[PDB]
């Protein structure tokens, strides 16, 4: 086509979703980490994880209001992931980088698997 | 705004 | 913070949600312009019009299923804006740049504004 | 993957 693109849309868009997560608006699901809860957008878990796009592409689990995660996953490495889903930023910090990486691998998100990897090779 |  | 981020991640975030709309998966809200009707995601519409972020952030409309547009509103130039929404894309077109500007304009989109007018000013 |  013969189109023209405004560069910073996508970011300024997930900008906008963060700040609706802060706010707690019209999130739809509670993300259940052991003890811990997390608010979030069905619709932004999918865009971001390989799990969530196959339960919330589920006939009977797209209408769950509450999704509990393996009792292995620890809630500081999904928090750490979530904050990623909604920002581009990870926390990525040698006190964190395992649960992260299993949390990711859990998760199915392929790029931050690879970085810490990567980050993991260059420490031994 | 650009030309992709 | 001491974060890393990857480049590519809110352009992905938004090709997803494009998908999503694609096939109709989780869409919540159908935008009515005149004759015409369009499903939408309401976080996406409010994260991208200041229009569509004070009716879903109203403690009413944010339950509505359907939202009817003004019917000055043209169907076509709301198609074009909505998929500039979802791809960061815009077709702007000789024959569509008025409908354009003042679809823009009713859904307070800004930067669209500022495009069609710079492209009108160079025009005359 | 940067440093922002
Ligand atoms: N929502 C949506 C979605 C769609 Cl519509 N199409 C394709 N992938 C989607 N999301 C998704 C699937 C697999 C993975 C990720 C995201 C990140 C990753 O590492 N694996
Ligand atoms: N969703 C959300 C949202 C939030 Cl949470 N905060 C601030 N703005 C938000 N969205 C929004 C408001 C005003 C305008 C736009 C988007 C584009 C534009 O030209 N005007
Ligand atoms: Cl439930
Ligand atoms: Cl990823
Ligand atoms: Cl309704
Ligand atoms: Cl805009």
Redesign the pocket.
Known sequence: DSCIQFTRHASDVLLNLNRLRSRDILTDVVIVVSREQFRAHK?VL?????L??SIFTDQLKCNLSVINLDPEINPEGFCILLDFMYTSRLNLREGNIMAVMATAMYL??????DTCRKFIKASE | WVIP
Chains 1, 3 share one sequence.
């Open positions: 619709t999918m865009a971001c994880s390989g969530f796009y199915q998100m392929e790029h931050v698997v």
